[model samples]
Target: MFPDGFVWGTSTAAYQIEGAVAEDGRTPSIWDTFSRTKGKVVNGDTGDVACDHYHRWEEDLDLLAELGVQAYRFSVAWPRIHPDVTGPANQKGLDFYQRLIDGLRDRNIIPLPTMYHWDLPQALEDEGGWIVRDTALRFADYAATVLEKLDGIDKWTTFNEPWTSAWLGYGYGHHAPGRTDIGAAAAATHHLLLAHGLGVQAARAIRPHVEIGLTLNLGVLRPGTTEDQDVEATWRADGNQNRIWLDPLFKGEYPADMIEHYSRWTPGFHTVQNGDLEIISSPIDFLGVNFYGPGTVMNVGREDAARAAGFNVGPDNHLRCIGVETPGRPKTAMGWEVDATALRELLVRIKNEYTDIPLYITENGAAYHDYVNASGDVKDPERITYLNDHLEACLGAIDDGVNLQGYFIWSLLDNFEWGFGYSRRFGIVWIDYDTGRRIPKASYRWYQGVVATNGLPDLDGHLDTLN
Candidate 1:
């Protein structure tokens, strides 16, 4: 599935780690505002003092070097670069990234930069955000602005997980810039993808070999019963969840069902011009997919009564459409089932249906309520087992001819977890948010050993028994 030189690494976002939110000419992003509102984040947690990577970057780089990672996938803050979209690129903003990029390069780590990862300049959001076509052009201008400064050094990506940026952030109200309007969500979806294509063009025009592409967090939906109603609902949910962004990027068109299903929302496709898909479908070097678990869906029933709980709830509540929640299964702190094998099947499905572009597992890791023992050692056996099984899933996908490129652990440190804030721990190295002390978990040392050997080290000796 991969050569010995395949890149392996971890990922993080600027807003989640860098906490000098107001300093050095940086302005407030949507996350900064959202987290400040009452009842938005748990314990009213804000990223204002998160991991503080803005100042401790050198320490982080040293940690990465010690972990033996070859590449580091991180998002550059758009507001940090263009604090105000209408204003010129801030040299202070550019300097911060220049230092971070130089640090990563100095450590011999390949820096994969995602241009937009939910951190839109406040000025753009003030102008109706991505619902307007003009916003896409604004993104291209910002892309050009950053690339001009980072052209020779950084590997760039236009957008990271646009689905969440558009759907979750706009439609569901689970992330920053939280708003609840399906119509607005659909419009934002189109514009986000459009912006990605525009940014791709901007990057290629500047640095053609910058290795630009999009990152989608793939959702694996499975029908729970043979009923036609169940299957049909599964199809619709899958269309919205999986195929909506996919069909356009790969085949140059949106999933027809998505357009018809969201007809009630009535999004004006007039802005989706003739040459839009041609630009959006530009040949990408690879696709970065973030897979967490398989979605088990059943026809809507009494169990799906909870569907009405969220803002993204559909109009009619498709009676037979419900996500199957497996019983008596191992779960993560996030409550996701521990079904690693689903990852193997997902990779195979993408290879069979989509283009054979090389794939990278850019984000994969579990969140657990970890703690340090009396001896001061954070020995998270559950996390170790979860990672070990997932690594096997990656190997299984590779053995099945998926052209799997490499695997990057979901996160590098326990910083901010979006809606969950810093409460849910997901990093191999545990960061005591109260004190900012990073204590390497047992899994961290385990990862270092595996990276050194290029093999999944046997962890049965250290792992607790699990069926």
Candidate 2:
């Protein structure tokens, strides 16, 4: 059982579900351009009419209300809020969220809004994007505008996952504003953190009582072998994936090893100004972590590691670790390994190693290939099993003394996934793309019972569960 008042909620990002991309004063975002680029998104799909949530948010809110979530965590689009990424705020965009919060309040659900979630304005991208220091300052302005307008919101998140924005988008060229420049990724990594600090200050200046934080998609980095090289590779992978962000956020300094390691790709840490870390390390009320799976690192030797890292293949390859498959483990449709035990281990590890600040599982859930059967029922037993076990893992973590405040499923509805487009469905509620119909999956009904009980429902007794 969860502690009393433990928050049960669902999360959604602006670009994934809110489909009125060109409506209002909203100009093009990086996603808009990336989705249109040939060979970027799957099936040539875009979020042009994704769930039509922009026009039918009332229906979506009704679904949340029916789900009995204690809070609703959603992101406000930077492109909609500041179409040009600077200058005066757009009234229509402000009005849209204003109505959203009002509806959330009416339903007794806490309004938790994330300021940025990978949707940088296209205009900002033209100006070097997160790589340049100017983008951070611009983010501060945009953040200030949002906080000033959405004052009633109690909890505010600065950025969803800076790691994805920097590494995936810039370094690997998998996400929007796609560019395969390690230097740009390193620069973006610093600037994104800088933007978070500036955003924290901006929000506090407007509302002192506002609960401010940033969300990181964290995982347990494990070594595939006990060999010295494999273990060293694990440490480096952990540093690259976890410490590079956590140390600066909680300890107020970048990890020494990571700094030295990343410097190989870039000429120097010229992007980091003297006072930058001070701003990035500003104390936050909470830490939001989005956990999907544990990351396993393998030392596949110099040549293999080099090839895995791609492009640069010399002594540099020794540092870039490779991820190996977990044989016999159940996997999500996204191919992520499933292990609820990792969630508990992660929570306890964070409590022991990091700050004692309250933590929220801001994004957790699996994507499965869902379909509505002849009975018109969307039965996703895989997702139901996934969520049920994870919630139990949360209980185990709480028992271990971790101050976990809440849990939010990755998304409320099936919408456009980045790059994969509409291929992966992470939502409890299934969306019939052709008809814009919302069909609550079996997991949705199961979750309602969990919410109602403040604990996991008796799975064995439920009609939907196997004997």
Q: Quick one: best lDDT, which candidate?
A: 2
Candidate 1 lDDT by residue in tens digits, 64-174: 999999998888898888887788888888887888788888888888888887888677777788777888899889889888887336457778888898888878788
Q: Give a tens-digit lDDT track for model 2, residues 1-467.
A: 78897999999999999998989988888899999999999998988889889998999999999999999999999999888764688999999999999999999999999999999999999989888889999999988889888747989999999999998898889998998888888889999999999999887788888889999987798776666887898898888678889988888889998888778666224588898888999999999989988867777554565345332333424356777765668889998889999999989988999988899999999999998888889888888788888888999999999999999997899989898999999999999888888999888888888899888876556644622
* Deviation in Å, model 2, residue 272 alpha carbon: 1.1
lDDT of 1: 0.80
Stretches of candidate 2 off by over 4 Å are 300-319, 460-467
10 residues in a row with least lDDT, candidate 2: 309-318
Residue 320 error, candidate 1, Å: 7.4
